[PDB]
Amino acid sequence: PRPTVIITGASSGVGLYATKALANRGWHVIMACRNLEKAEQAAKNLQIPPEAYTILHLDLSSLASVRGFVESFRALNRPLRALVCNAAVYYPLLKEPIYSVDGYEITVATNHLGHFLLINLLLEDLKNSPESDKRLVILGTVPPDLGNLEGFEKGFKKPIAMINGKPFKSGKAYKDSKLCNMLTARELHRRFHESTGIVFNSLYPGCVYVSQELAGERVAMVVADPEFRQSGVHWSWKAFVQELSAEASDEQKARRLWELSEKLVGLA
Ligand SMILES: [Cl-]
Ligand SMILES: [Cl-]
Compute, in angstroms, the gap from residue 170 CA to the centroid of ligand 2. Answer: 9
Within 8 A by CB and 6+ apart from 59, the residues are 34, 65, 66, 114
Compute, in angstroms, the gap from residue 100 CA to the centroid of ligand 1. Answer: 15
Compute, in angstroms, the gap from residue 91 CA to the centroid of ligand 1. Answer: 3
Compute, in angstroms, the gap from residue 90 CA to the centroid of ligand 1. Answer: 7
User: Residue 91 CA: which ligand is closest?
Assistant: 1
Are the C-beta atoms of residues 34 and 15 closer than 8 Å to each other?
no
Domain count within the chain: 1
Domain that holds residue 69: 4-265
User: Which CATH number fits the domain that encloses residue 90?
Assistant: 3.40.50.720
Chain centroid offset of residue 108 CA: 12
Within 8 A by CB and 6+ apart from 227, the residues are 221, 239
Neighbours of 192 (CB within 10 A): 17
| Three-class SS of 131-185 | CCCCEEEEECCCCCCCCCCHHHHCCCCCCCCCCCCCCCCHHHHHHHHHHHHHHHH
Q: How was this structure determined?
A: X-ray
User: Residue 107 CA: which ligand is closest?
Assistant: 1
Resolution (A): 1.3
Cα–Cα distance, 228 to 122 (Å, whole number): 21
Q: List Cα–Cα distances, 259 to 97, 124, 208, 266, in angstroms.
A: 24, 18, 33, 11
Cα–Cα distance, 37 to 17 (Å, whole number): 18
